[PDB]
Amino acid sequence: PALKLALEYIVPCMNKHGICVVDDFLGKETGQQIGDEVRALHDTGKFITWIEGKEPGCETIGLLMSSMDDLIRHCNGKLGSYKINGRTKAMVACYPGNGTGYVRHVDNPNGDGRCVTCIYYLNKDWDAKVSGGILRIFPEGKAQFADIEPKFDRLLFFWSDRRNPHEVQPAYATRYAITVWYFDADERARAKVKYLTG
Ligand SMILES: N#Cc1ccc(CNC(=O)c2ncc3nc(N4CC[C@@H](O)C4)ccc3c2O)cn1
Numbered sequence: 417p418a419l420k421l422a423l424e425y426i427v428p429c430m431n432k433h434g435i436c437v438v439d440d441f442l443g444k445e446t447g448q449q450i451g452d453e454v455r456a457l458h459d460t461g462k463f464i465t466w467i468e469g470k471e472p473g474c475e476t477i478g479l480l481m482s483s484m485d486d487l488i489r490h491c492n493g494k495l496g497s498y499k500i501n502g503r504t505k506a507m508v509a510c511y512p513g514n515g516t517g518y519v520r521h522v523d524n525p526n527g528d529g530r531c532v533t534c535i536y537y538l539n540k541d542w543d544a545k546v547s548g549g550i551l552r553i554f555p556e557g558k559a560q561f562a563d564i565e566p567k568f569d570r571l572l573f574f575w576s577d578r579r580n581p582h583e584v585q586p587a588y589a590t591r592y593a594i595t596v597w598y599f600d601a602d603e604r605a606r607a608k609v610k611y612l613t614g
C-alpha cells in the first residue's frame with residue numbers, strides 16, 4: 417500500500433515536519449530474517465560495510481531496499497522539490513552498548529547530494545528505558561525536539577541537511593540498523609562538478 421502510504425503520510429509529514437516515523441514496516445517475520453542476516457555478517461565476514469542488495473546472504477536486506485525505494489518512487493517527486501534519481505548502497509552498521517553516544521551532527525552538512533536520510537532499525541524487544549540508544553533530532557526552525565527510540569521494524573525518514581541536526585544517547589546493548597541516503601539529482605550534480613574544479 418505504498419502509493420497511499422507515501423502520498424497520505426510520508427509526503428505531507430516530511431514536507432511539514434522534515435521527519436517521518438513509519439513503525440511496523442516489514443512485519444516481525446521479515447525483520448527477523450534481516451536481523452539474522454546482519455548478525456551473520458557481523459559475527460563472521462561473508463568473503464561498517466556497504467551492501468548493494470544482491471549479495472549471497474543479503475537477500476532480505478535487498479528486499480528492504482526495494483521496499484524503501486518503492487515508497488520513494490510512489491512519493492512521485494513530492495518530497496520537497498527534490499528529484500530523487502538514485503541513492504547510496506545500504507550501510508549496515510553495528511552500534512555498541514559501551515555507554516558511548518554520537519555527538520550532535522548533520523548527516524549532510526556540505527551539500528554532497530544526499531537529501532533524505534532513511535534508517536531501518538533491527539533491535540527486537542528494545543526498551544530504551546534499560547538499553548538507551550535514543551535519537552534526539554532538533555528540527556532547525558522549531559520550538560521542539562524529538563526523542564525517537566531505535567525500535568524494531570521502525571523506518572525513519574528525515575532531511576539529511578542542516579534542518580535535522582541529531583545526536584544519539586548512549587546505549588548499553590549492541591544495536592543494528594541499516595541506513596540509506598537518497599540523492600537529489602541537481603545537488604549530487606553540483607557536488608560532482610564541485611569536487612572536480614569548483
Ligand atoms: N540503531 C542505531 C543507530 C542509528 C544511528 C546512529 C547515529 N548515526 C548517525 O546519525 C549517522 N549519521 C550519518 C552518517 N553518515 C555516514 N556517512 C554517509 C556518507 C559516508 O561518507 C559517511 C556514516 C555514518 C553515519 C551515522 O552513523 C546510532 N545508532
Ligand SMILES: [Mn+2]
Pocket residue numbers: 521522523582
Ligand atoms: Mn546521523
